[PDB]
Design a protein around this nucleic acid. Structure first.
Ligand SMILES: [Mg+2]
Ligand SMILES: [Mg+2]
Ligand SMILES: [Mg+2]
Ligand SMILES: [Mg+2]
Ligand SMILES: [Mg+2]
Ligand SMILES: [Mg+2]
Ligand SMILES: [Mg+2]
Ligand SMILES: [Mg+2]
Ligand SMILES: [Mg+2]
Ligand SMILES: [Mg+2]
Ligand SMILES: [Mg+2]
Ligand SMILES: [Mg+2]
Ligand SMILES: [Mg+2]
Ligand SMILES: [Mg+2]
Ligand SMILES: [Mg+2]
Ligand SMILES: [Mg+2]
Ligand SMILES: [Mg+2]
Ligand SMILES: [Mg+2]
Ligand SMILES: [Mg+2]
Ligand SMILES: [Mg+2]
Ligand SMILES: [Mg+2]
Ligand SMILES: [Mg+2]
Ligand SMILES: [Mg+2]
Ligand SMILES: [Mg+2]
Ligand SMILES: [Mg+2]
Ligand SMILES: [Mg+2]
Ligand SMILES: [Mg+2]
Ligand SMILES: [Mg+2]
Ligand SMILES: [Mg+2]
Ligand SMILES: [Mg+2]
Ligand SMILES: [Mg+2]
Ligand SMILES: [Mg+2]
Ligand SMILES: [Mg+2]
Ligand SMILES: [Mg+2]
Ligand SMILES: [Mg+2]
Ligand SMILES: [Mg+2]
Ligand SMILES: [Mg+2]
Ligand SMILES: [Mg+2]
Ligand SMILES: [Mg+2]
Ligand SMILES: [Mg+2]
Ligand SMILES: [Mg+2]
Ligand SMILES: [Zn+2]
Lengths: 159, 205, 104
RNA sequence: UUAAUG
RNA sequence: GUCUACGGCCAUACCACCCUGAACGCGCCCGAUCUCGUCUGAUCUCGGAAGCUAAGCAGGGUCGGGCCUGGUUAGUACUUGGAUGGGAGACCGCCUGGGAAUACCGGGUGCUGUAGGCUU
RNA sequence: ACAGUGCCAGGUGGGGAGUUUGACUGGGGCGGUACACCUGUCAAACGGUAACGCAGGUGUCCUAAGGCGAGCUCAGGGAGGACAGAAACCUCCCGUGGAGCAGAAGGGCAAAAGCUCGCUUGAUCUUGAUUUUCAGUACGAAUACAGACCGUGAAAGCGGGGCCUCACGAUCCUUCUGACCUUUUGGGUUUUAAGCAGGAGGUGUCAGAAAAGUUACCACAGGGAUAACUGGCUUGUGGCGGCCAAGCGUUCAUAGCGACGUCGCUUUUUGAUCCUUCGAUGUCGGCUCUUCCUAUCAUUGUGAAGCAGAAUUCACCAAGCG
RNA sequence: UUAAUUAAAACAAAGCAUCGCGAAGGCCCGCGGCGGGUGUUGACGCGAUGUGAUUUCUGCCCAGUGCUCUGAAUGUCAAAGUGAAGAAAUUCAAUGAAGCGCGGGUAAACGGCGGGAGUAACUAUGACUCUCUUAAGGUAGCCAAAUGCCUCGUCAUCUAA
RNA sequence: AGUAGCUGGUUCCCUCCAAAGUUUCCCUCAGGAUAGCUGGCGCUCUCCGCAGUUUUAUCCGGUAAAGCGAAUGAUUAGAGGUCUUGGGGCCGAAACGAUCUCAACCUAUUCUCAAACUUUAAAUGGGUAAGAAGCCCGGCUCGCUGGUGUGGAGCCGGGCGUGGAAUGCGAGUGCCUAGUGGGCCACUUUUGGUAAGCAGAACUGGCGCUGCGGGAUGAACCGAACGCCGGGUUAAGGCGCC
RNA sequence: GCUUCCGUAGUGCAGCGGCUAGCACGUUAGGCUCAUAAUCUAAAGGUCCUUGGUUCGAAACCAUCCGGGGGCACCA
RNA sequence: GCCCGGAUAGCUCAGCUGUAGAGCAUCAGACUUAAAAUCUGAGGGUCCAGGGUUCAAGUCCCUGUUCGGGCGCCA
């Protein structure tokens, strides 16, 4: 059977990328973490204190507690019958912001601007995202030259 | 002696080479991988023919040795001792195992290293003979006699390249004339326009 | 391992860091009038043989050494136990080693 | 006390 | 146009050689009384300003190496799902989407935040 | 007045009594621990993932190899310099780590996490929360905080053991420590004892019985979940047949053989597995007796010889008769 | 002698060699007794053994496990008794039997009783010589035996084989 | 009427629902406990929520492939070098003086690889978001942090409904709880083994628990799942006769 | 095959990481002897089986390799 | 765990708080023609390690580390 260690099979995962070893960048340290921000988790092997677990590498949760040099985050772990919203304490190095919340906030701000606009006008402009439709009919202009006749190539052995 | 090649004919396992973990491997029979006149230039052996496999199988080092001797004898009988250059382009690294039964049985069954074998893909060159342009059917005959030492099926293809190079024969003379290629023994040196100008002046001076 | 005989550390009754004389801890003598000892003597007294089990499968070869830290201050004189990981060789304040010397 | 051979 | 001090992203910023630096600056430089530290004022610290761009440094160049970004490799290798497809097998072909990486050939060679100068 | 008897106490005591003689296991036994943990891989790019799958490691060690702060840069290579040389000491240049961080491996680390100095004991006390193993229970390990006392640094801060992933142990009993702590029984004092809290003495079969064999004199309840014999799949091995042709055959690859290699058939051998059978399928030989196969020893008919005759080899139709 | 699968090489047997006991004893039975069997006995006896007629012998070893002897010269050693301070429960000290250790014997007690090299003037064998080790290293006899894997050992005889 | 974790048996009908041979622990491996699957009893709402699904954005990888003119471990062969050194000589007393070399070394190449190598790097996949529990305002409290009615958190009082992707479906929640804890087979990936109707894994579906048409035969294959019947039509398979 | 052990001058042995490897014999040289022996005095001689690792240092400790020697090989 | 013995020069053993002794061994002088046999002097003591009492300790006292000899066995 396999061993049940903390860092079993984490050869490539906590390893730093190529030519990205050395001193940890400091904007990652000084970037502030508010409560209730959607946060993805990516481990780092330089700072060994406050590492998450290999099941939480790649997972995304949100911050409930903030301490001096670490924050707590409620992530969703699927354990053998069900998904549990469980909380882990992660140091600053293993934490980035998720922009999936940021794109949604930009879309909410755009929808609020488009809702305040055209209210006294009366034009009904669509606010919902409509998916990629069947495209409209169009005219392919084959001006000048005729289309090039594609001939399938005969077989010839290169090796 | 040892087992027939019907056992380890096909690629069954992962590639398992001789390394720090796999130690105690006996030495393979094939060690001299080229012969003929290897102390030669690219200009004096234009023609090149390859033995290209057509099966994803495992060719043994002893079969490589037997086919090398079988090609060597016909090339010495036909083209002389210094009129050809044979090159085996399959180095056997896959260490293959043996489960010898003297009674334990299948319990604790992991093989001791039996021998070496070469992992062969479809469309991969087994042997390659470069020679003069007059000796074409002789190289076809030598590779045809060397096909019988291997299992499976492989084809004989005379290449469009100039010997053991990656450049075509109709373009090779023009590139040597415009000094883009230098004869450097068996291989060739390709000079781009990417280097410094002192190399260009050393070439054209 | 090597530990010193003088350790300045926290004190329970005082509340500050004070020095402590450090000695090793050994098991005291078993009292005949303890409750389980009286129960074992009454249970063994009579016919029946050995009633309670006798442990025999001793596996590990070393013990957890315990330091008995007595306070140096004469008014307090408080003591407590301190647990350290298992070690075979052990001594108190002997041969404080140097750096970069001739080994003969 | 030891002291064999040609 | 550019520098100094503190920085962000950490090679488009690195490395080898060559050329030019007006002004402020940055430095090289002059000494050990005091603060300080060494075998040694070489480092560190202190007190300065005779000389200098020689060097660091700044800018630029090399059919430069590296690095970054594209084409080619190539719809190639590979791969989700499918078949009463093939073949003795090995493996291969097709339907349905997705889709690389070497060699090779182009381009580029730091942007920027705060404060304070210089070219008055 | 001792043998002796009655009762205690110590020794001896399979003469006798009771009981035990672990587990996994390509049957069991022997051998190993795959029984408690850790690294790389298997593992199929979140996680999880098995075999007596592979390579290994552990029950330690450290008064520093823990915690700060400062200063240096390592391994290696080149050039040199009295003894001095492949190697003793010094200097210069290059040197992204090719050294070191105690160990097995992996990750990480350059004005450091390495080396050397200066001071210390955050390897101290106390609640709670969380991760890992997981049933979402413990133990062990760790993660952020909080309340105090502290160390270092000028300070920011760092530190409540080891740069991270392993180095360890329930109830019951015993021992030590702590509170001007509780009970010790009708009340009061003092020993003693029982409590509460924190360590320690251990169960390695590591969620933890106190445990030697033999039975061919054996027994019982079961199992084809499991061996010994037949039949199954498979064919390493045993036997048999082809392909290529370096050579043997005075001359000549193939009359007859045939290396180096390679492709197949058979269940007349041994293996491999455990599918059938343990509410029984009688275990090896020999005697007798019937039938079948050809991979043909002889006989019928034929082709080739290194077939002059004879004798003998190779191949075909061929199992009728021996 | 295994009644009902083994009539034998097994058991027994005489011969041989041991051990204990002089009776308040040796061996043994019995819940118990001033109990009982040997014993209506007394070392030419009883009880416990091993081997197995006659002839010839009975090699060496007490390292190990047994058995046995000797004992204030004595390390340990329980209960009882003695001293001790405490208010007492008490703990401490001294004294301290048998048996264990210490010191001899015993192998017709259980049992056990080697290895590697060189060496004779053709070659082998090698008497002989060197070395390591135990408590000696298997002596006299015997043997491919009922005992020998290799083994259907080698030679001769018995056979055509 | 000793015990048995071990065999054998266990007595009427219909209807409805419907499994598992798996996690962890146990002197545990023929057995239990505990989760998981199952049934029953309900309750709280409806006439917003949820999804074995896709899309739009946004993070993760280190497998397939590829690479050794990039690191590590290998590994094959020719070129050009200089004294960086040396084995044999040669003309030298000797001399980096000269000389043909042959060896290691250096520089540009070249052939073949790696489950325990990797600069790159897929397909499939795994998280998160796609709004009322959300924005925009105004003000109080704090013993926390603080050049600064600074920052953060918690309270209030209002204003915004175009239910802020596609499609589909009524949802949430609490007890009691049997049986199971021997599995097997199949496209693909893959460990050991020469291979096995062999042993052991990953995804998913079947058999077990399941009838029916076909494969002559048949626990697993293809189609397709089942109340009792009539008309029609197909799938998979076939259409000489049976 | 499994578990275990050994491998040191010429020969048989020892050896507690830090030696000049130790004892005996053999060998050679010198005395004694008429010679020989024995005896006496001197001396030579170890690839520490091989590779690697730990170590400041390895004949030993750790790993593998090549030699060698015993114990097991089982009921059916 | 309790009790009692020893650990001292290369080796075996004594040692009553005030140059550590006896024997074997080595070296150096006699003897013999010479070794060996036998005399003579000399050298060699971490008194197991540390602490305490005393003016002074190998000795007295505990604390630990090795080595026997017997007892005792509820995690
Ligand atoms: Mg395999
Ligand atoms: Mg009693
Ligand atoms: Mg100066
Ligand atoms: Mg300058
Ligand atoms: Mg300049
Ligand atoms: Mg460039
Ligand atoms: Mg008894
Ligand atoms: Mg008994
Ligand atoms: Mg068993
Ligand atoms: Mg996956
Ligand atoms: Mg520092
Ligand atoms: Mg450290
Ligand atoms: Mg604190
Ligand atoms: Mg009372
Ligand atoms: Mg028997
Ligand atoms: Mg019997
Ligand atoms: Mg079966
Ligand atoms: Mg059979
Ligand atoms: Mg065969
Ligand atoms: Mg010939
Ligand atoms: Mg099975
Ligand atoms: Mg029958
Ligand atoms: Mg025939
Ligand atoms: Mg009978
Ligand atoms: Mg009879
Ligand atoms: Mg006798
Ligand atoms: Mg005798
Ligand atoms: Mg005796
Ligand atoms: Mg004899
Ligand atoms: Mg059972
Ligand atoms: Mg991986
Ligand atoms: Mg690959
Ligand atoms: Mg069952
Ligand atoms: Mg099971
Ligand atoms: Mg299987
Ligand atoms: Mg079903
Ligand atoms: Mg069905
Ligand atoms: Mg059929
Ligand atoms: Mg289908
Ligand atoms: Mg119908
Ligand atoms: Mg039909
Ligand atoms: Zn105190």
């Amino acid at each position: 059977t396999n061993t049940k260690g903390k860092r079993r099979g984490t050869r490539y995962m906590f390893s730093r990328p190529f030519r990205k070893h050395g001193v940890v960048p400091l904007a990652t340290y000084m970037r502030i973490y508010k409560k209730g921000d959607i946060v993805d988790i990516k481990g780092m092997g330089t700072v060994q204190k406050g590492m998450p677990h290999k099941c939480y590498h790649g997972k995304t949760g949100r911050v409930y507690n903030v301490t001096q040099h670490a924050v707590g985050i409620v992530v969703n772990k699927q354990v053998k019958g069900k998904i549990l919203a469980k909380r882990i304490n992660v140091r600053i190095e293993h934490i980035k912001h998720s922009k999936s919340r940021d794109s949604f906030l930009k879309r909410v701000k755009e929808n609020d601007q488009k809702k305040k606009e055209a209210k006294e006008k009366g034009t009904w402009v669509q606010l919902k995202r409509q998916p990629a439709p069947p495209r409209e009919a169009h005219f392919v202009r084959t001006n000048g030259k005729e289309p090039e006749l594609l001939e399938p190539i005969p077989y010839e052995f290169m090796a | 002696g040892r087992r027939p090649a019907r056992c380890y004919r096909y690629c069954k396992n992962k590639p398992y080479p001789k390394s720090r973990f796999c130690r105690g491997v006996p030495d393979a029979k094939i060690r001299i991988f080229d012969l003929g006149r290897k102390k030669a230039k690219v200009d004096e052996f234009p023609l090149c023919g390859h033995m290209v496999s057509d099966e994803y199988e495992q060719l043994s080092s002893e079969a490589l040795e037997a086919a090398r001797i079988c090609a060597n004898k016909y090339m010495v009988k036909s083209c002389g001792k210094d009129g050809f250059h044979i090159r085996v382009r399959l180095h056997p690294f896959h260490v293959i195992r043996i489960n010898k039964m003297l009674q334990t049985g299948m319990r604790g069954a992991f093989g001791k290293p039996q021998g070496t074998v070469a992992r062969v893909h479809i469309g991969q060159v087994i042997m390659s003979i470069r020679t003069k342009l007059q000796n074409k059917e002789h190289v076809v005959e030598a590779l045809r006699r060397a096909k019988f030492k291997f299992p499976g099926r492989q084809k004989i293809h005379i290449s469009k390249k100039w010997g053991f190079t990656k450049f075509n024969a109709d373009e090779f003379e023009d590139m040597v004339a415009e000094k883009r290629l230098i004869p450097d023994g068996c291989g060739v040196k390709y000079i781009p326009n990417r280097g410094p100008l002192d190399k260009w002046r050393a070439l054209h001076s | 391992v090597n530990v010193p005989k003088t350790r300045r550390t926290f004190c329970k009754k005082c509340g500050k860091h004070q020095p402590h004389k450090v000695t090793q801890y050994k098991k005291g003598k078993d009292s005949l009038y303890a409750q389980g000892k009286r129960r074992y003597d009454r249970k063994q007294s009579g016919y029946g043989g050995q009633t309670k089990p006798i442990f025999r499968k001793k596996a590990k070869t070393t013990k957890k050494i315990v330091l008995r830290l007595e306070c140096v201050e004469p008014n307090c004189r408080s003591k407590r136990m301190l647990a350290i990981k298992r070690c075979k060789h052990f001594e108190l304040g002997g041969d404080k080693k140097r750096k970069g010397q001739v080994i003969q």
